[PDB]
């Protein structure tokens, strides 16, 4: 048994949000089915009709301090863009990574990222980075390389 959670992209800001529930569905003749979404930590007034195929995906994963080795240049990640009036998760691509020795606080690595939507670039810590679930594959590979 493996849990599968989802995140959906809002038409309001183009950011991704955790899905708490799928409330209903609607189908069109021209395609692209849509699903009514209740967002985690948001009321009913924020419910939204979401394009299922292009704006709903498997949930991005907040990184363990160990899992920094699964964040590589070229990757798509879900990155927390924190501003003065707004702080949202946006799709970004890793351009480079400065990997430094960990400490008691955990990961000390820095990642240069570029947000897909505004082309802005930012240096972020691992705590602001969410991995695409498929990168677990990499980790699994790494786990196979261990000693028995």
């Amino acid at each position: 048994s493996v849990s599968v959670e989802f995140e959906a992209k809002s038409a309001r800001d183009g950011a991704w949000y955790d899905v708490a529930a799928f409330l209903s569905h609607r189908l069109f003749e021209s395609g692209d089915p849509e699903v009514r979404v209740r967002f985690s930590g948001f009321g009913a007034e924020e419910d939204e009709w979401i394009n299922v195929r292009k704006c709903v995906r498997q949930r991005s994963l907040p990184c363990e301090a160990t899992e920094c080795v699964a964040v590589l240049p070229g990757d798509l990640i879900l990155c927390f863009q924190e501003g003065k009036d707004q702080a949202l998760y946006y799709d970004a691509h890793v351009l480079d990574a400065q990997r430094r020795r960990h400490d008691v606080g955990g990961c000390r690595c820095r990642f240069l990222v570029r947000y897909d939507h505004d082309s802005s670039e930012e240096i972020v810590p691992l705590r602001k980075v969410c991995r695409r679930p498929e990168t677990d594959y990499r980790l699994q590979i790494l786990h196979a390389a261990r000693a028995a």
Binding site: R12, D13, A15, Y17, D18, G41, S60, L61, P62, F80, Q86, A87, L88, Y89, R127, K128, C130
Partner: peptide
Amino acid sequence: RTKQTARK
């Protein structure tokens, strides 16, 4: 695996 709290 808790995410940061998004602020719109």
